[PDB]
Ligand binder design. Structure first.
Ligand SMILES: N[C@@H](CCC(=O)O)C(=O)O
Ligand SMILES: N[C@@H](CCC(=O)O)C(=O)O
Ligand SMILES: N[C@@H](CCC(=O)O)C(=O)O
Ligand SMILES: N[C@@H](CCC(=O)O)C(=O)O
Ligand SMILES: [Mg+2]
Ligand SMILES: [Mg+2]
Ligand SMILES: [Mg+2]
Ligand SMILES: [Mg+2]
Lengths: 252, 252
């Protein structure tokens, strides 16, 4: 498989998932219908989304790490799937929620070769390969803000900060992308628990990196070794090169 | 005038504005074109929105209190207008932003008789008259959450809280209606400055009360006396009847 197949697969799925959620009225979407292998409830929207997604994926030589169904397949290419990121929003008609894939040549992020995030409410399409970062076909890159007084997406602010704006949209895959097209200046998830899971971040981090951003663990460490398993967890500090270190301090 | 008129006017404006913004490309929307009588920059997006709206309201027997142009007219009915709430989002193509009208029979919120908030990205229409609260024509009400571990929209978190979720979407008018229809459990702007301005909250507060919400100031105090002027600034604590008082202490 190559980063063009990925684009094709990814787009095919975005079609099917988008179609799946569009039909389902809100009262249907919001129904807990399962326990997800993740250990959080599978809403009905999660189920129809992942079923559609998985159906296209099962045909490829891949191991899929997805939120509702766990780890599936045995192929050498690993795919980290959040078949609906921002499920909460989606069950309430709030239009920030996405399907998110990240393809890796191994079970570690450092061997990623494609990131895809598709806003299922708007149709905005984010992805990245060796050629760079795109939004709706158009090359993108991060902001150059240098002052802590910037536009921050942050999970969760636990004290007085210096930022110009703070926002939290409830779709990390999409919010990594908002950072990656310079809509926002940084992206932090500093929640002490380490809540983010491989399928939540993987595509966003990749796409953001390709768009110039510097994206690290809390302590400043690289994300390269983060694993594609159900068990992996993440904190993120993402910001262009100048801003990042200052944030790294502010967090201390 | 009458609520039915208010409804007709409000709709006319949502049409003209929704249209003005949709034609205007992002790179145009995001340009600072003035200082607003409110004391923040007017963007091109704020201006084409406000102009569109004001073209319609000029023909009515009203005093308008808007964000970019200040206080205009002599008429006995006051109209708190945010001609575009969530400007930041609108300039980045993030789908939460809207136009927000609130009509009152005096310069005081207690004398309000219509609230309107129309999501300009999605076309969701929120409003409320003597009859009650509506989203897209259908009656709405708040949630019955009784537990602090709830879905909170909150500007801004300054410490560890106990909520199930926190979100900040950057359109107070729309976020108030998210609470109004039960999508979130509560709305808090506890920002020490008291940052909010009349045309940001008025429609949202109204629409929330008519949908069941208890909506007070930081200290439980009533909002009825909040004036329709540019000086007026607000904190909000909104939550259903049971939940509300629990929150009022939580923030001491
Ligand atoms: N495959 C989706 C959209 C994805 C895309 O065009 O990138 C569709 O045709 O509806
Ligand atoms: N009432 C909300 C609580 C949050 C949750 O269960 O996810 C819901 O059904 O979603
Ligand atoms: N002119 C507005 C009002 C809403 C309605 O007529 O239903 C619109 O349709 O976008
Ligand atoms: N052009 C502005 C957008 C809004 C603002 O921050 O005032 C910026 O650099 O952020
Ligand atoms: Mg999911
Ligand atoms: Mg998720
Ligand atoms: Mg405005
Ligand atoms: Mg505004």
């Amino acid at each position: 498989m190559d980063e063009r197949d990925a684009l094709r697969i990814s787009r095919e799925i975005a079609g099917e998932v988008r179609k799946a959620i569009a039909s389902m009225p809100l009262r249907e979407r919001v129904k807990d219908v399962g326990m997800g292998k993740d250990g959080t409830p599978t809403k009905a929207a999660d189920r129809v989304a992942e079923d559609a997604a998985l159906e296209i994926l099962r045909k490829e030589r891949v191991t899929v790490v997805t939120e509702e169904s766990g780890v599936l397949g045995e192929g050498d290419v690993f795919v980290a799937l959040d078949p609906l990121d921002g499920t909460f929003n989606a069950t309430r008609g709030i239009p920030v929620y996405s399907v998110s894939l990240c393809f890796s040549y191994s079970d570690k992020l450092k061997d990623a070769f494609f990131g895809y995030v598709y806003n299922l409410a708007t149709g905005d399409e984010y992805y990245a390969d060796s050629s760079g970062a795109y939004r709706n076909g158009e090359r993108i890159e991060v902001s150059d803000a240098e002052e802590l007084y910037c536009n921050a997406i942050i999970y969760y602010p636990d004290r007085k900060f210096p930022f110009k704006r703070m926002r939290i949209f409830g779709s990390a895959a999409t919010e990594l992308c908002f950072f990656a097209d310079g809509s926002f200046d940084c992206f932090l998830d500093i929640r002490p628990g380490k809540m983010l899971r491989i399928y939540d971040a993987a595509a966003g981090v990749f796409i953001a990196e390709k768009a110039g951003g510097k994206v690290t663990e809390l302590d400043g460490e690289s994300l390269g070794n983060k694993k594609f398993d159900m068990q992996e967890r993440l904190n993120i500090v993402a910001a262009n090169e100048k801003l990042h270190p200052k944030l790294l301090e502010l967090i201390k």
